Each structure stands twice: as C-alpha cells, then as structure tokens.
C-alpha cells in the first residue's frame, strides 16, 4: 500500500 | 370441501383459480382438505413451470439485444441503471411466482415432490440474478473516469469548459440511490456539482454558439460592420469579464443571463 | 372485436425512429400528431421530427411535416388555437409549430435558461378555458413552468417539485382530471405517483402514492362523464409488468393487473366507455380491459405483426378507433367493435358496483397477507 | 492483509487529489502529508480485517449456543423419561414379588 | 465519542493542513475536506462497531462456556441414571426368578 | 468532526 504514492513521488527524481 | 369442489364449475381460467386458491389458502392446513385437492395442484404446478420456463427464455436473450434497452434509452434511462432495473424486475417476477407456488402447495412447499425442483431452480436462478458485480464495475469505471468540473469557464477558439455527458452520471447517481445501492459520497458530491452547474453551462454554451453563429454572419457581410459594432465590443467586454471567472465562482449566476439577454438583443 | 383499420409510415421521415407521443385534435378529430426520436443512421437529417396524419383522406403521405434540430419526445395540439402544434424536446425547448406558416422550422421556442427547462421535457399540455389558458410543461428534473401561448420567451410561473427534505422528483408522466385546472397527478421515474397543485399555499407535491417498484411510464385520469362521477380515479403503467388502478382518496393501489410478460408502456382510459382502457407492451400486444366484464383477463388483445415494442397508445375522441405507435416507426391504427366501445345505460351503475367490489377484494387480500 | 474494494476506492480518490495538488503547485505539498495518510489507510484495512473475524466468530459461536440449549433440553427430557420408567417398573414388579412372597409363605 | 488514535492522527493531519494552508494559499485543501472527514469518520465508525462486537463477544463466550459445562454435567447424570436403572432391573429380576424356581420346588 | 477542520479553514478566511 505504501508503494503506490512512493512511486507517485519518484516520478521526477 | 363440497363448497370448494365447485372450482372448475366456477373458474374457467387459471388466473381466477389462482386468485380463489390464494383467497382460501388457510383452509388447507387441515389434512383432509389438503388431500381433497390433488388433481388441481398438478395442473397448477405445470402452469407455473411453463411460466418459469417462459421467463427463462426471456432471460435467454441479454439486455443489449433486448428491446427493453431500446425502450429505456428512448425514455431517458442510462444503460447501466436500465440493466439494473431490468434484472430487478425479472427477480421480482421470480419472487412472485415463488409466492404463487407457495400459495398453491400450502406450507412446507419446499420439501414437496414438485416443490423441491422448483425451489432449487429458483435459488439457482436468484444466484444468477444479483446485480452487485455490475454495480461494482460501474463504480470502478466512474472512479477511473474523473469527469471534473473545476476550472475556468472558458477554454481557448471560444468554448466552455464543460462536457455535457456528465449529466448522465447525475442520472445514474439519482437512480442507483433509489435502488438501495450505497454509492460513495465523492461521486454524489460530483453529481451535485454537475447538477448545480448544468443549466448555467447549457446557457453559456448556447450563448457562445449564438455569438459565433452571428459573428460568422457579421464577418461575412462587412458592409454593415459600423452599425453592429456597438454591442459587439459590449459582449466582448462581457466575455473578458467572464475570463477571470471560474466554475467555483458564485458570480456566474447573474453573469449567465447578463450575457444571454445581450446575445439575444444583438441577434434581434 | 379488434380489427386493423389503417397503417401509417413514411420512408423519408418515419424510418428508423421511435414514436414518442400521440394526440388527436379536439377541433379536428380526424388528425393525429406524432413525435419521433433522432435517427442515428443519418446525422445530416433533423433529429426531432413531427408528423401530422389524417383520417378522412386515403393519402399515405402525411399532411404536414415539422422538424427541429433536437430530438422531440413530447408533442400535442393546442386546445384553443387550431393552428398550433406544441412540442417538447430533449434539450428542453418548448417549440411551437404553425401550419399556416410555410416554414417547417419551429416559429417560436423557449430559451435554454435556468428559468426554463434544461433537462428533457416529456410532458406538455394546455389547460384552462377559451379566454384563459396556459401551457404546462414539466421536465425530467422536476421543474414545471407555465407559458402563455402567445409569448414564449419567458415562463409565467416556475417552481421545482420536491419531496423528502427537498429532493427533486423525476417526473416522467402527467395527467389532468376533467374539470380541474389547479390539481393534477404526475408519474415518476422513482416509482411513486405524486399529487400536485399548481397554485396555492401547498403549491407543489402533496401526497405519496406508493406501490410501484419500477419507473412509471404512463398515467391517465378518468375521462368518461355520465350519471355518477368517477374523476377521482386514474390508472398508471410502469416497468414492473403491472397496470395499477388508483384513486385520489386512497394511499394504496386499488387493483394490480398482471396479465403481461414484459414492460408496459402506456395506458389511457376510453373517453366514452367508463370502465374501459387499453395498454401496450414490449411484445406488440395491445390489450383491452373492460372492468365490468372481468378483472384479470383482457377483453380483446391483438398483436402487431413482426412483434415490435409499442411505445404509445391513444384513443380517439369518438372512442371507436385507437392508435398505437411502435418502436420502428409505423403508427398502426385499430378500430374497435360496437359490442366493446359502446357503453350501455347501466354501465355507470355496473361500474358503481364494480369498484366497491374490487376494493373489498383488495382489503381481503391485504388482511390475508397480514395474517 | 488483503485490501478491500472500498479502501482501494477511497485511496484512489486520495491519489487523484494528490496528483492534482502535485501538478497544481509543486512537489513540496505531498512530502509530509502522504506518510501521515498511508498509516491511517493501513489502519482502515486492519480494522476491517479484524471486524470480519469478529463477525465469523460471532456467527459460529452463536449457532453453537442454540445447538447447546436444545441439546441440553432434549437430554434433560430423556433423563426424565428414564426417571419415571424406573418408578413404574419398580413399584409394579415390587408388588408382584411381594404377592409371590406371601403366596410362597402360606 | 472520538477515539484517541484517530484523534492523534487527526492532530497530525491538522498540523500538516495548517502548514499547507499557511505556506501557499487557501485553495490547497478546498478539494481535500470532504474526502478526509469521510476517511476519519470511516475509521471512527468501524472502530466503534468493533467496540460493540467485542463486548457482545465476551458475553456470549462466557455463557457459552457455562452452557457447555452444565450440559456435560447433565450428560454425566443421564448416563449414571441409565446405569443405575439397568443394574436395578437385572438384580431384581434375578432374585425374582430365583424366587419362582423356589416356588417350583 | 466537521466543525474542527471547518474552524481550521474559516479561522482566517
């Protein structure tokens, strides 16, 4: 469940 | 019993015999009265089985191939809600026929010789007649679609930032709430947002289409351009006033008719 | 007996369209208007289109053709102006057509403002008298506006029909009792008949009428006038495969008619015979119900060839003919026999004994269910 | 820990709002709010998973109560049926052995 | 009543919401209110339902254990009564037929 | 729980 928005974040890094 | 054995001499059709069998149902708790009526029960079971098979052939075709989908679409029913309605009325007819066979066979009808197959097939048919999965799939695709209403009231050529198909979602929300489904609250609030802005958006898109249809006429006939430029800049000022407005604004409510009557005046 | 009289179809206009409303002019009893949905095959063709047909002539061509750019699904004559045809469309315009004008474009239309209807309009009607009458239209969102028939750019009165902590109802049908202008009944998509008042301190929806589990598709108040009054009765049709008879003095349905094996679309009373009405289904079977004869079996039922869905049904003012409208677009007209259409002298008295018996049977059934 | 459809739906709406707020202003909106949201989102799934265990335990132990009550009642009744047949057999065959005793005494 | 874990996580998102409101503008959370109150109300209501289920669970488990014990004791009494009955049966019939062979002598 | 975030918002708007 934590993976979803972590991916949300790492899009531009 | 002799007062009940004149049934064929009174009832000429199975429907009034159904009705008089339903009216006099409580006399059949007595075992002698239950044993007295046996040649009627077999015919009644065969008629109910024929009706159940006929409704099975009604459900043999699907909702897209049915004429009911066409007749619901011509009566402004969204197709998801029309399918839900159609399956629920099929289930209601099945429950009515189960009530009929319970009335005809008396109590303990599920354990009877003929009632066992009827009850088992009714259970297996009602398992296939539920509408939860189609509702869940509709909810998932609505929660995937994201028909938003937020933003400025214009988009650039002149057009209004409003898809007109969002009013279907409001129809499905106001229909599925009637059918006992608990839709999520964000979808209900989006339907509220659509239903609030829909007449104003319709008047906006109609005034914009009127303005461009007369602007084509103005730019086609250039000889009278001096006469009609008095209010062309006025409605351009109205448009530029509405450029700063967004859909969340509460100042659109005077603004829509304040655009509309000027558009009608410029048309006239 | 039930027999075929005439068949109406136009290849250019009526092809691949569903009939959506039927009416017969009171001044010209040989005329019939019609209303059609959009043609999905030809977007270049007009979406809404209205046709006027005739009885006296033998000509298969329609007498007048009217059309509109949006799909019209509610059409009627004007009661006190013979030259006018009122239509209600998908977009919410209430267009007005004139036969004396040579243009098939609508000569007048209401604005698409929030003051007027923006949701589709399925009911349009004219009530009032010769020297005082308005045009009444209710849209699907529950908005009902009154229009003067000479000036159409602004509604006269407007309010929204709400109930249950001011939730908007979804008006799908409409009827008016004979001799009444202020009180009327509506159907609903939410499956419940309401009673409404036009103007007053309780102007708006008055009462629940409960008992339909499906969307109500057609209602009609009683119209036949004789020795004993019957104007408080009306019959509704719905998607629940039932036709239900109601009265305004009862919160519950009087009797449910369950002869059908499909959706039921319209029902309306005979204007002459007091205990006679007709209903249509999704299998083309126009049924006739005589309440003084039997309460569970249609008196005369015939099927349309090819079996399409019959949308609308509408009697004539004479009551000797009856017009149906199918799902492909052919207005099929039947004429009923003299043994069914003609009311006898005791028919009002026989129905005066009939309704009471029906109510008694209903009470018996309900007590049985309770126990 | 299987996620339900309802928690996935409202987390999808949270994902929608978070993408909208990321696109609208900057990255720095989400960088402290999403760890304060995801633990509550895990807590929703945890409390639903515990609640369904509570429901199935309630149903099985309830039906075991109604099994126990009627089984004990039937067993008490069939103990009573043992306890008057004893008495009837006892006094009947005691009277017969007493009449046998006095007839063999004389 | 508001539960304390929901109150603490509520305070966490309250100070986060104050940070985002003071940092940029007032439209940061205008689309975030009816989502987050629904999520917190969901957690509170399901936790309250769990709280009801726990106490009714402990009541029915307790009298379940009591009913099991008393039914086991009833089993013991029933089996003992049947054994005493069949023993008294055999013994009395035994000396009765010893009496009738004494009669036949 | 509405009132509290409501205050959050109107406290300075």
From Swiss-Prot, chains A, F:
PTM annotation (Phosphothreonine): residues: 13
Coiled coil: none
Superkingdom of the source species: Eukaryota
Location(s), subcellular: Cytoplasm, Cytoskeleton
Family: Belongs to the dynein light intermediate chain family.
Summary of the function given for this chain in its UniProt record: Acts as one of several non-catalytic accessory components of the cytoplasmic dynein 1 complex that are thought to be involved in linking dynein to cargos and to adapter proteins that regulate dynein function. Cytoplasmic dynein 1 acts as a motor for the intracellular retrograde motility of vesicles and organelles along microtubules. May play a role in binding dynein to membranous organelles or chromosomes.
Subunit structure, as described in the record: Homodimer. The cytoplasmic dynein 1 complex consists of two catalytic heavy chains (HCs) and a number of non-catalytic subunits presented by intermediate chains (ICs), light intermediate chains (LICs) and light chains (LCs); the composition seems to vary in respect to the IC, LIC and LC composition. The heavy chain homodimer serves as a scaffold for the probable homodimeric assembly of the respective non-catalytic subunits. The ICs and LICs bind directly to the HC dimer and the LCs assemble on the IC dimer. Interacts with DYNC1H1; DYNC1LI1 and DYNC1LI2 bind mutually exclusive to DYNC1H.
Name assigned to this protein: Cytoplasmic dynein 1 light intermediate chain 2
Organism: Homo sapiens (Human)
The organism's taxonomic lineage, starting at the top: Eukaryota, Metazoa, Chordata, Craniata, Vertebrata
Residue range from the parent sequence: 429 to 441 of 492
UniProtKB/Swiss-Prot annotation, chain B:
Record's subcellular location: Cytoplasm, Cytoskeleton
Stretches for region Interaction with DYNC1LI2: 87-225
Disease: Charcot-Marie-Tooth disease, axonal, type 2O: An axonal form of Charcot-Marie-Tooth disease, a disorder of the peripheral nervous system, characterized by progressive weakness and atrophy, initially of the peroneal muscles and later of the distal muscles of the arms. Charcot-Marie-Tooth disease is classified in two main groups on the basis of electrophysiologic properties and histopathology: primary peripheral demyelinating neuropathies (designated CMT1 when they are dominantly inherited) and primary peripheral axonal neuropathies (CMT2).
Notes concerning its domains: Dynein heavy chains probably consist of an N-terminal stem (which binds cargo and interacts with other dynein components), and the head or motor domain. The motor contains six tandemly-linked AAA domains in the head, which form a ring. A stalk-like structure (formed by two of the coiled coil domains) protrudes between AAA 4 and AAA 5 and terminates in a microtubule-binding site. A seventh domain may also contribute to this ring; it is not clear whether the N-terminus or the C-terminus forms this extra domain.
Record family assignment: Belongs to the dynein heavy chain family.
Listed name of the protein: Cytoplasmic dynein 1 heavy chain 1
Protein's organism: Homo sapiens
Taxonomic lineage of the native organism: Eukaryota, Metazoa, Chordata, Craniata, Vertebrata
Full protein stretch here: 565 to 845 of 4646
UniProtKB/Swiss-Prot annotation, chain C:
Protein name, per record: Cytoplasmic dynein 1 intermediate chain 2
Superkingdom, taxonomy of origin: Eukaryota
Biological process annotations from GO: microtubule-based movement; transport along microtubule
Covered residues, full protein: 264 to 634 of 638
Subunit composition and interactions: Homodimer. The cytoplasmic dynein 1 complex consists of two catalytic heavy chains (HCs) and a number of non-catalytic subunits presented by intermediate chains (ICs), light intermediate chains (LICs) and light chains (LCs); the composition seems to vary in respect to the IC, LIC and LC composition. The heavy chain homodimer serves as a scaffold for the probable homodimeric assembly of the respective non-catalytic subunits. The ICs and LICs bind directly to the HC dimer and the LCs assemble on the IC dimer. Interacts with DYNLT3. Interacts with DYNLT1. (Microbial infection) Interacts with human adenovirus 5 hexon protein; this interaction probably allows virus intracellular transport.
Post-translational modification: Pyrophosphorylation by 5-diphosphoinositol pentakisphosphate (5-IP7) promotes interaction with DCTN1. Serine pyrophosphorylation is achieved by Mg(2+)-dependent, but enzyme independent transfer of a beta-phosphate from a inositol pyrophosphate to a pre-phosphorylated serine residue.
Subcellular location: Cytoplasm, Cytoskeleton; Cytoplasm
Swiss-Prot record, chain E:
Lineage: Eukaryota, Metazoa, Chordata, Craniata, Vertebrata
Residues of the full protein shown: 24 to 128 of 1336
Post-translational modification: Phosphorylation by ROCK1 is crucial for the recruitment of JNK.
Function: The JNK-interacting protein (JIP) group of scaffold proteins selectively mediates JNK signaling by aggregating specific components of the MAPK cascade to form a functional JNK signaling module. May function as a regulator of vesicle transport, through interactions with the JNK-signaling components and motor proteins. Promotes neuronal axon elongation in a kinesin- and JNK-dependent manner. Activates cofilin at axon tips via local activation of JNK, thereby regulating filopodial dynamics and enhancing axon elongation.
Designated gene of the protein: MAPK8IP3
Signal peptide positions (record): none
Origin: domain of life: Eukaryota
Cysteine pairings via disulfide bonds: none
Assembly and oligomerization: Forms homo- or heterooligomeric complexes. The central region of MAPK8IP3 interacts with the C-terminal of MAPK8IP2 but not MAPK8IP1. Binds specific components of the JNK signaling pathway namely MAPK8/JNK1, MAPK9/JNK2 and MAPK10/JNK3 to the N-terminal region, MAP2K4/MKK4 and MAP2K7/MKK7 to the central region and MAP3K11 to the C-terminal region. Binds the TPR motif-containing C-terminal of kinesin light chain, KLC1. Pre-assembled MAPK8IP1 scaffolding complexes are then transported as a cargo of kinesin, to the required subcellular location.
Spans annotated as Kinesin-binding domain (KBD): 27-57
Domain RH1: from-to ranges: 1-77
Species assigned in the record: Homo sapiens
